[PDB]
Amino acid sequence: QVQLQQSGPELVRPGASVKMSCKASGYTFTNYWMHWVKQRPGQALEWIGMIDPSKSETTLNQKFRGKATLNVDKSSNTAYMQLSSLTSEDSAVYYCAREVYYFDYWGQGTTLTVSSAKTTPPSVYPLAPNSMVTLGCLVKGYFPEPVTVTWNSGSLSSGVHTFPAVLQSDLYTLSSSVTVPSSSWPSETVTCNVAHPASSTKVDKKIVPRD
Amino acid sequence: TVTYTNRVADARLGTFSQLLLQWKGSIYKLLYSEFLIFISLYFAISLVYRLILSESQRLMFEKLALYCNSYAELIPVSFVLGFYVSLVVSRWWAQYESIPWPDRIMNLVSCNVDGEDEYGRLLRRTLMRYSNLCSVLILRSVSTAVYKRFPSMEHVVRAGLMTPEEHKKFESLNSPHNKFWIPCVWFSNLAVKARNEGRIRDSVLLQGILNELNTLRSQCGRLYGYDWISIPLVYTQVVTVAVYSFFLACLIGRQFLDPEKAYPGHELDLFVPVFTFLQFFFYAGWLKVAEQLINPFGEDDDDFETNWLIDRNLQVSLMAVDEMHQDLPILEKDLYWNEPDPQPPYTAATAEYKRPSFLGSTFDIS
Amino acid sequence: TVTYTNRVADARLGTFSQLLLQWKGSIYKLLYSEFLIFISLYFAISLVYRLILSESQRLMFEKLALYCNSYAELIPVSFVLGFYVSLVVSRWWAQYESIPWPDRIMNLVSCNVDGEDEYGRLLRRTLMRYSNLCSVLILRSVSTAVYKRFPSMEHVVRAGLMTPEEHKKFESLNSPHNKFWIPCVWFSNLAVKARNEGRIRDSVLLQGILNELNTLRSQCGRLYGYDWISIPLVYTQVVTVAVYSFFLACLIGRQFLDPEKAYPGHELDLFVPVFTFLQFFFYAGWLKVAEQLINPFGEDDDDFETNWLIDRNLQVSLMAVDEMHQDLPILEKDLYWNEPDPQPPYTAATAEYKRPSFLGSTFDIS
Amino acid sequence: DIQMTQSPASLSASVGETVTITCRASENIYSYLTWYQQKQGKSPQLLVYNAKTLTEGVPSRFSGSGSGTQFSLKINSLQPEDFGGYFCQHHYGTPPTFGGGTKLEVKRADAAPTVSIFPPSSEQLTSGGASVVCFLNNFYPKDINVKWKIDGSERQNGVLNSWTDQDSKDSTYSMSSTLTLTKDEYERHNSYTCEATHKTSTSPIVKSFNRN
Ligand SMILES: OC[C@H]1O[C@H](O[C@H]2[C@H](O)[C@@H](O)[C@H](OCC(CCCCC3CCCCC3)(CCCCC3CCCCC3)CO[C@@H]3O[C@H](CO)[C@@H](O[C@H]4O[C@H](CO)[C@@H](O)[C@H](O)[C@H]4O)[C@H](O)[C@H]3O)O[C@@H]2CO)[C@H](O)[C@@H](O)[C@@H]1O
Ligand SMILES: OC[C@H]1O[C@H](O[C@H]2[C@H](O)[C@@H](O)[C@H](OCC(CCCCC3CCCCC3)(CCCCC3CCCCC3)CO[C@@H]3O[C@H](CO)[C@@H](O[C@H]4O[C@H](CO)[C@@H](O)[C@H](O)[C@H]4O)[C@H](O)[C@H]3O)O[C@@H]2CO)[C@H](O)[C@@H](O)[C@@H]1O
Ligand SMILES: [Ca+2]
Ligand SMILES: [Ca+2]
Ligand SMILES: [Cl-]
Ligand SMILES: [Cl-]
Ligand SMILES: [Cl-]
Ligand SMILES: [Cl-]
Ligand SMILES: [Cl-]
Ligand SMILES: [Cl-]
Ligand SMILES: [K+]
Ligand SMILES: [K+]
C-alpha cells in the first residue's frame, strides 16, 4: 500500500534553517514526481515545488526560489525539503504528495513553528460571575503548544467549550467555558485542570464564587 | 519542432540573414554559457598580460602565444566536424522516419474490420489502441520528453492509453525485457480472432493488416536500436578533443601582443578579438549541431515533438476506425464529369504558375 | 553497448565535456599503450638531444628535426581518415541492422499456427526455435563473444538451443559448408507440414510466414557477407601508413630545439609538447574509431552485445508463441469511448509540451 | 500563473441535500482539474481527477463536470461524512495552483448566543494585568459581531477573539472575546460592557459589569 511518512513537527528560532523528510513506500520511488505543499490557516494551499527522484531535477515555485531546497535519497526512498532564513510566516503545515496527473497520496503533514520564545508555564486565572450558570478558565502567557484543559479531572466533560489558542506578543492564550445548572454551583465543587507537557506543568484552579 | 520552413520558402535578400535574429533553438541560446566562459578566460588572460606580467614575463607570454597560435589549425578540425556532424544528421532523420504513424494500419482496420454494431466498434477501436500502445511504450523508453509524461505504467493507464485489464495481462506476462512488443502480439492475435468471428472476410485482407502491423513493429525496433546503439563514445570524444584543442590554442595564441615589439602578424591591438570570437561561434556552434541532434528525442528546442504526435495519433486513429467506418459522403458527379480536359481555375496571384505541359527535353518547344 | 544516449539527451553546458571523464569504451582506454610508447620515444629522443649529442651532432639533429617537421601534414591524413572511418561506420551500422530479430516471425507464428493443445504448443515453440537456431548458428560464426560461449556444437545443444535429435539430423546432412542455413530449411518444411495438418488455415497465411523466414535468412546472409568480405586490406594499410607517417615526423620534428639558435617557429622550450600530444589523441583516437568498429562483433567495450540479444530473443520468442497464443486481455470500452477529440493529461513537468497542431508551413498561425 | 477562483467560500446544507461547488480558471486548462476533500486536522484526499473521473474509494454520489475555464463539483444526497473541506487544483503546468477552498457545514435552526461576561480575576490583578473575558456560546449561523465599550466609548485596541468549529452534536458555533488592559488603565474606568450583534435579533445582546 502506498504510504508517505513525513518527519515529526519542528520548532525553530527565526533566521535558522530546518530540513524535513518524507519516506515513501509501497511503490517505485523513482517513477513518480514528489511535490511539496504549504498549508497556512485562512490561506489557500501553496505549491512549493517538485522533484524528479530519478535525476534529482528540481522545479520550484518562483515565490519559494530562495526559501526552499529539494533533494532525495533513492537508496532510502525518502525525499527532503530544506527551508532557510526562517521567519514567522514560514510557520505552517507542510505536505509531500505523489503525482500521477494528480496528487493521489499525501503525507500526514509536518508542522513547523517559528518564534523566538523560551518555554513558559501557563498562568491559570479563574472566571467567576440564570437557570444554568456559565463558568470558565483563562490560560494566558504560555508556550509552546499545546495544553490540555479538563474540568474535574475529566469527569465533567459535557457542556464545555475550549477555544483555540491565540498569539499575543510571542505567547499563547486560550479560554475554556463550562455551563452547569445553577443548583449544582457553588454546591458542587468545580475546578479546571490545565496540563502543559512542554514545561511539565499541571495546575488546578477551583473557581470560587466572587466575594 | 522549430519550423522556419515558411520563412525560407523563397530565396530573397534576407532569407538567411533574418534567421540570425531568432532566439528559439538558435546558436546564441546553445552557445551562451560556453561563450561567456571563453570571453572571461580570454580577457582574464589579457589583463594579466597587460597589467600584471613583468617586462621579462611579457616576453615569455609573447613567445608562448606565438607557439599556441601556430597550433590553431581549422582544416583538421573542420574535417572531423563535417564527417561527424554528417553522421549525427543522418541518424537524426532516420530516427524521425522511425517514429511510427497509425495511418496505414488505420486505413485497413477502418475498412476491413466489419460491423456497425457496438462490438464491431469496440473491435476496431481496440485494434488501433494496441498499435498506439506499442508506440507509446517504445517512445517513453527513448524520449525523455515522453517519459516525464509517463514515468510509470500507471500514468499510461490513467491517461487512457491502456486499460487496467490490459495492465493486468501485461504484468501477468513475466519477462525481464522491455515489453513494448506485447501490444503488437495482442494485435495480431486479436486480428486473427476477429477474422474467425467473421469480422474479417478473407485471409488476404487479414495478412494485409498483419503486414502493416509488422511494419510498425519494425519502426519501434529502429527507435530502440538508435537509442541502444549510441554513436561510439570514442568518436564523440575525438571531435570534442579536436574542437577544445583549437579553442585552447586560441585562448593564448589569439591574445593581442605588444604592437611595439612588431611581431609579424600582430601589428594592431584591438583588445577584442572579433574574428576569433566569430570562429568560436562557427566551430562551437557547429559542434552544438551534433550536440543537439545526437539525441533528437530529448527536450531541446529542436528535438522532436513526440508528445504532440502521440496526442494527434490517438485522436485521428480512433476517429478513422470508428466515426469513419463505412461512413462516406454522398456520391456526386464531379464538376468535370463531361470535361475530358479540365482547366481548374487560378487565383490572380497564381496565374503565372499555369504552365504548358513539360513533354520532355528532346522535344522542340513550338 | 556503451550507451550514453540519456546523458546527451539535451544540449546543455557540459553535454559533451562530461564524456571526457568516462573510461569505459573511451579514447583513453583505447590509446593507453600507444600513447605511452609515443611519450617514451619522444622524451627518450629529447634527452639524447639535451644530454648526449655533441654541439656538432645537435646541429645535425636540429636540421633533421626541421626536415621531419615539414612532413607532418594533417590535411592529407585527415582526408583518408574521414573517408575510411566513414566506410567503417557505414558497415558498422549495416551490420547491426543485419542482426536478426524474431519479433516479425514471432507475431505471425503466434497467431496463425492453430491449436491450444500440446501439439499446437510444441509446433509453435519448435518453429521459433528453428528461427533462433538459424540466428545463433550464424552469430557464433561471426561473433567472437558468442563463439567463446558456444565453441562447439555440443554447447549449442546443452544450452537448449538445439535438441540432440536435431543435432543428429544436423550431422546426418553431409556438407562441407557452414550449415547455419539448415534450421531455416527445417522451418519452411515444418511450416508446410503444419499447414497440411490443418494447423495453418490458408496458403496466404503460410506464404506470409515463409516470407518473414526468408527475410531472416537474408539477415543471416548479410552478417556472413560482412564477416567474409573484409574492408580491402590495402585500404586499411594505407590509412595506418599515413597515420604512422605523421607520428614518425612528429617524433623528431616536434622536438623542442635550442631556443638560443633562434630557429623560426622554435622560440620557446616547454619540454612537453602539449599540442603535439593533443594531436596524437585526435588522430590516433580517430584511427581507433575504425580500429574498434571494423569488427563490431568482437569483445570491445563498444562492440555489440550479441549474447544478451540471443538470451532476450529466446525468452521473448517462445513466450509470445506459447503463453500468448490466442491469449488476450478482457476487451473493455476505452476511456475515450464517447470522446471524439481526446485530451490525454500531462504531468506538471511536461505541460509545456502540449502544442497546437502543426497544420503546415503555408497556413497563417492565427 | 493560472488563478483558481472557488465558490462558495462556505456552503451550509443538511443531510439528503444536493450541493454544487464551483471552480473557475484564469485561462483554459482543458480537462485538467482535480477535486480534493479535506477534513479538519487531516491531510487532503483525492476525489475527482481529470475533471470527471472519480478515484477508487469515492462513492457514486460524487460527480465532477466542466471543461476550459468553468468546472464544478456536485454532491447529491449528502451524508454525515461528506461534511468538511473541499478544494480544487488545476494540473495544467507549473505551478499547479489551488483553489481558495469551501467549508461544507451542517444547516440547522437559528439560535441566539448565550453571552457571559467575566471580570478580571483577583489572582490576575495582583499580577499586574487585567483581562475581561466574554463568551458567546451555542449560536447559529457562524456569522457574529462583538464590540467592547469601556464606559460607553468603543474599545477596539487590545481585543483578541477565538472561534470554535461547528459542534458535532448540536451543530452550533461559539466564540470568546478577550479585552486585555493594564491593571492601571483597568482601574481608571467603571463599566465594561460586551455588546454582541447577530441575525437572531435586531437589538444587540449586551452583557456588562461594573468594577465593584
Ligand atoms: O516570400 C517572400 C518572403 O519575404 C518577406 O520576408 C522578408 C522580410 O520581410 C524581410 O524584411 C527580411 O529581411 C530583413 C532584414 C534584411 C536586412 C539584411 C540585409 C543584409 C544582407 C547581407 C548584407 C548586409 C545587409 C534581415 C535581418 C538582417 C539583420 C542581420 C543580423 C545582424 C547582422 C547583419 C544583419 C532586416 O531585418 C528585419 O527587421 C525587422 C525588425 O528588425 C524584423 O521583424 C519585423 O517584422 C515585422 C513585419 O510586419 C515588421 O513590421 C517589424 O518591423 C518587425 O517586427 C524582420 O523579421 C527582420 O528580418 O526577411 C525576409 C526576406 O526573405 C515576406 O515578409 C514573406 O512573404 C517571405 O518571408
Ligand atoms: O537533461 C539535463 C542534463 O543536465 C544534467 O547533466 C549535466 C551534469 O549535471 C553536469 O554537471 C555535467 O557537466 C558538468 C561538468 C561541467 C564543467 C564543464 C564546463 C566547461 C565547458 C567548456 C569550457 C570550460 C568549462 C563537465 C565535466 C568537465 C570536465 C572537463 C574535462 C577536463 C577538461 C575540461 C573540463 C563538470 O563535471 C562534473 O563533475 C562531477 C564530478 O567531477 C561529475 O559527477 C558528479 O555527479 C554527481 C551527481 O549527483 C555529483 O553529485 C558528484 O559531484 C559527481 O559524482 C559529473 O558527471 C561531471 O560532469 O554534464 C551535464 C550537462 O549536460 C543533469 O544531471 C541531467 O538531467 C542531464 O544529463
Ligand atoms: Ca537533443
Ligand atoms: Ca571490435
Ligand atoms: Cl589549418
Ligand atoms: Cl523488427
Ligand atoms: Cl581576432
Ligand atoms: Cl598539412
Ligand atoms: Cl539470402
Ligand atoms: Cl607541441
Ligand atoms: K542573405
Ligand atoms: K560543451
Which regions of D17-108 does DSSP assign to beta strands (E)?
19-25, 33-38, 45-49, 53-54, 62-67, 70-75, 84-90, 102-106
Q: Are B77 and B242 in contact (CB under 8 A)?
A: yes
Apex D203 CA angle, D198 and D205, nearest 5 = 65
Cα B306 to Cα B140: distance, rounded to the nearest angstrom: 9
Instruction: Find out whether the peptide bond into A14 is cis, omega within 30 degrees of 0.
Output: no
Q: Would you kindly state where each structural domain of chain C is located, as residue ranges?
A: 1-332
Q: Which of D27, D48, D91 to mutate to test the interface with C (most CBs of C within 10 A)?
A: D91
Which of C13, C26, C28 has most ligand 2 atoms within 8 Å of its beta carbon, as the pocket-test mutant? C13
Which of C6, C7, C18, C274 has most ligand 2 atoms within 8 Å of its beta carbon, as the pocket-test mutant? C18
Q: What is the resolution of this structure in A?
A: 2.8
Ligand 1 in contact with B7 (CB < 6 A)?
yes
Q: Which of B131, B178, B229, B303 to mutate to test the interface with C (most CBs of C within 10 A)?
A: B229
- For residue A109, give the H/E element and its range: none
Cα–Cα distances (Å) from D78 to B73, C47, D17, D18, in that order, read 80, 96, 5, 6
From D59, D79, D108, give the residue that closes a domain.
Answer: D108
Q: Where are the alpha helices (DSSP H) in chain B?
A: 27-47, 55-69, 74-96, 103-112, 118-142, 144-147, 153-158, 164-172, 182-196, 203-228, 233-253, 274-293, 306-321
Determine the residue type at A2: V
DSSP bridge partners of D86: D37, D102
Q: Which residues of B touch C212 (CB under 8 A)?
A: 214
Instruction: Find out whether the peptide bond into A197 is cis, omega within 30 degrees of 0.
Output: no
Q: Which of the 8 DSSP states describes residue C52? A: I
- CA C198, C199, C205, C208 torsion: positive or negative? negative
Residues making up chain A, counted from first to last: 211
What is the DSSP pairing of strand D102-106 with strand D10-13?
A: parallel
Instruction: Find out whether the peptide bond into B329 is cis, omega within 30 degrees of 0.
Output: no
Only one residue has cell 617557429, namely: C265
Only one residue has cell 494566558, namely: A140
Asked if the Cβ–Cβ distance from A33 to B159 is below 8 Å, we say: no
> Which residue among C345, C348, C354 places its CB closest to the CB of D94?
C348
| The three grid cell numbers given for residue C81, joined into one nine-digit string | 581518415
Ligand nearest to the CA of B283: 12
Which structural technique was applied? X-ray
Q: How many CA atoms lie within 13 A of A84 on its CB side?
A: 7
- Helix, coil or strand: residue B258: coil
- Helix, coil or strand: residue B130: helix
- Helix, coil or strand: residue C165: helix
Give chains near C: 3+ CB pairs under 8 A: A, B, D
Q: In chain A, which residue's Cα lies nearest the Cα of B157?
A: A100
Q: How many CB pairs under 8 A join B and C?
A: 287
For residues D148 and D70, membership in a common domain is answered with no
Name the phi and psi angles at B212, rounded to 5.
Answer: -60, -30
Determine the residue type at C217: R
From D44, D73, D108, give the residue that closes a domain.
Answer: D108
Q: Are C83 and C214 in contact (CB under 8 A)?
A: no
- For residue C154, give the H/E element and its range: helix C153-158
Q: Which atom of ligand 2 is nearest to the CA of C12?
A: 63
Neighbouring residues of D133: CB distance < 8 A, sequence distance ≥ 6 = A127, A136, A138, A175, D117, D118, D176, D177, D178
Ligand nearest to the CA of B142: 3
Which of C16, C21, C22 has most ligand 2 atoms within 8 Å of its beta carbon, as the pocket-test mutant? C21
Q: In chain C, which residue's Cα lies nearest the Cα of A49?
A: C348
Q: Are B239 and B286 in contact (CB under 8 A)?
A: no
Cα B11 to Cα B57: distance, rounded to the nearest angstrom: 54
- Using the Cβ of C349 and the Cβ atoms of chain A, whether some distance falls under 8 Å is answered with yes
Query: What is Dmax (Cα atoms) for chain A?
Result: 73
Ligand 2 in contact with C9 (CB < 6 A)?
yes
Ligand 2 in contact with A57 (CB < 6 A)?
yes
Name the phi and psi angles at D45, rounded to 5.
Answer: -135, 140
Topology classification of domain A1-116:
Immunoglobulin-like (2.60.40)
- Helix, coil or strand: residue C336: coil
- Helix, coil or strand: residue C130: helix
Ligand nearest to the CA of B4: 1
Apex D59 CA angle, D57 and D64, nearest 5 = 100
- Helix, coil or strand: residue C171: helix
| The three grid cell numbers given for residue A42, joined into one nine-digit string | 485562512
> Which residue among B66, B214, B232 places its CB closest to the CB of C292?
B232
For residues D21 and D86, membership in a common domain is answered with yes
- Helix, coil or strand: residue A2: coil
Ligand nearest to the CA of C103: 6
Q: Which atom of ligand 2 is nearest to the CA of C21?
A: 31
Cβ density class C17-35: b for 16+ within 10 Å, e for less? eebeebeebbbebbbeeeb
Cα C17 to Cα C30: distance, rounded to the nearest angstrom: 18
From D108, D132, D157, give the residue that closes a domain.
Answer: D108
Determine the residue type at A205: K
| The three grid cell numbers given for residue C319, joined into one nine-digit string | 513466450
Asked if the Cβ–Cβ distance from D93 to C351 is below 8 Å, we say: yes
- Helix, coil or strand: residue C49: helix
Cα–Cα distances (Å) from C23 to A208, C41, C296, D70, in that order, read 85, 25, 19, 56
Asked if the Cβ–Cβ distance from B161 to C312 is below 8 Å, we say: no
Determine the residue type at C81: L
Cβ density class C212-227: b for 16+ within 10 Å, e for less? bbeebbebbebbbebe
Q: How many CB pairs under 8 A join C and D?
A: 19
Cα D56 to Cα A1: distance, rounded to the nearest angstrom: 13
* Ion ligand 12: residues, CB < 5 A: C 16-17
| The three grid cell numbers given for residue C94, joined into one nine-digit string | 549495416
Ligand 2 in contact with C20 (CB < 6 A)?
yes
Only one residue has cell 467506418, namely: B325
Q: How far is C295 from chain A (nearest CA, A)?
A: 35
| Residue numbers of the domain that contains D192 | 109-212
Q: Are D48 and D34 in contact (CB under 8 A)?
A: yes
For residues D136 and D190, membership in a common domain is answered with yes
Q: Which residues of A touch C349 (CB under 8 A)?
A: 33, 50, 52, 59
Cα B143 to Cα B161: distance, rounded to the nearest angstrom: 17
Asked if the Cβ–Cβ distance from A179 to D163 is below 8 Å, we say: no
> Which residue among D43, D114, D121 places its CB closest to the CB of A106?
D43
Cβ density class B308-321: b for 16+ within 10 Å, e for less? bbbbbbbbbbbbbb
Q: Which residues of A touch B151 (CB under 8 A)?
A: 31-33, 54
Q: Which residues of C touch A52 (CB under 8 A)?
A: 349
Q: Are B242 and B73 in contact (CB under 8 A)?
A: no
Cα B191 to Cα B210: distance, rounded to the nearest angstrom: 8
Q: Which of the 8 DSSP states describes residue C323? A: T
Cα A156 to Cα A193: distance, rounded to the nearest angstrom: 11
* Ion ligand 10: residues, CB < 5 A: C 273, 275-276
Cβ density class C179-211: b for 16+ within 10 Å, e for less? ebbbbbebbbebbeebbeeebbbeebbbebbbe
- Domains: count for chain D: 2
**CATH code, domain with D62:** 2.60.40.10
- Helix, coil or strand: residue A8: coil
Name the phi and psi angles at A98, rounded to 5.
Answer: -95, 140
Q: How far is A14 from chain D (nearest CA, A)?
A: 24
C-alpha C144 to ligand 4 mean position (Å): 10
Cα B136 to Cα B306: distance, rounded to the nearest angstrom: 9
| The three grid cell numbers given for residue C135, joined into one nine-digit string | 540466428
| The three grid cell numbers given for residue C35, joined into one nine-digit string | 600513447
* Ion ligand 5: residues, CB < 5 A: B 73-75
Cα C80 to Cα C67: distance, rounded to the nearest angstrom: 23
Q: Which of the 8 DSSP states describes residue A85? A: S
- Using the Cβ of A2 and the Cβ atoms of chain B, whether some distance falls under 8 Å is answered with no
Best CA proximity match to C91, nearest among C190, C215, C230: C230
Q: Which of the 8 DSSP states describes residue A156? A: B
Q: How far is B125 from chain A (nearest CA, A)?
A: 24
Q: How far is A134 from chain D (nearest CA, A)?
A: 7
Best CA proximity match to A13, nearest among A85, A94, A65: A85
For residues D139 and D194, membership in a common domain is answered with yes
If you write DSSP's letter for every residue of B17-68 in order, what string do you get?
GGGGG--TT-HHHHHHHHHHHHHHHHHHHHHIIIIIS-HHHHHHHHHHHHHH
Ligand 1 in contact with B10 (CB < 6 A)?
yes
- Using the Cβ of A100 and the Cβ atoms of chain B, whether some distance falls under 8 Å is answered with yes
Q: Is D118 exposed, middle or buried (0-12, 13-18, 19+ CB in 10 A)?
A: buried
For residues D78 and D1, membership in a common domain is answered with yes
Residues making up chain B, counted from first to last: 366
Residue whose Cα lies nearest atom 65 of ligand 1: it is: B7
Cα D207 to Cα D197: distance, rounded to the nearest angstrom: 12
Ligand 2 in contact with C5 (CB < 6 A)?
no
Helices B233-253 and B74-96: crossing angle, nearest 10°? 140
- Helix, coil or strand: residue D137: strand
If you write DSSP's letter for every residue of C220-269 in order, what string do you get?
HHHHHHHHHS-S-HHHHHHHHHHHHHHHHHHHHHTS---TTTTBTTB---
What is the DSSP pairing of strand A110-114 with strand A10-12?
A: parallel
C-alpha C6 to ligand 3 mean position (Å): 9
Cα B221 to Cα C97: distance, rounded to the nearest angstrom: 10
Cα A196 to Cα D46: distance, rounded to the nearest angstrom: 36
- Helix, coil or strand: residue C54: coil
- For residue D125, give the H/E element and its range: helix D122-125
CATH no., domain A117-209: 2.60.40.10
Query: What is Dmax (Cα atoms) for chain B?
Result: 97
Neighbouring residues of B147: CB distance < 8 A, sequence distance ≥ 6 = B140, B141
Cα B223 to Cα C3: distance, rounded to the nearest angstrom: 14
Instruction: Find out whether the peptide bond into A146 is cis, omega within 30 degrees of 0.
Output: yes
For residues D128 and D176, membership in a common domain is answered with yes
Give chains near B: 3+ CB pairs under 8 A: A, C
Best CA proximity match to C256, nearest among C65, C52, C25, C105: C65
| The three grid cell numbers given for residue B306, joined into one nine-digit string | 513526440
What is the DSSP pairing of strand A34-39 with strand A92-99?
A: antiparallel
Q: CATH 2.60.40.10 in chain A: give the residue spans.
A: 1-116, 117-209
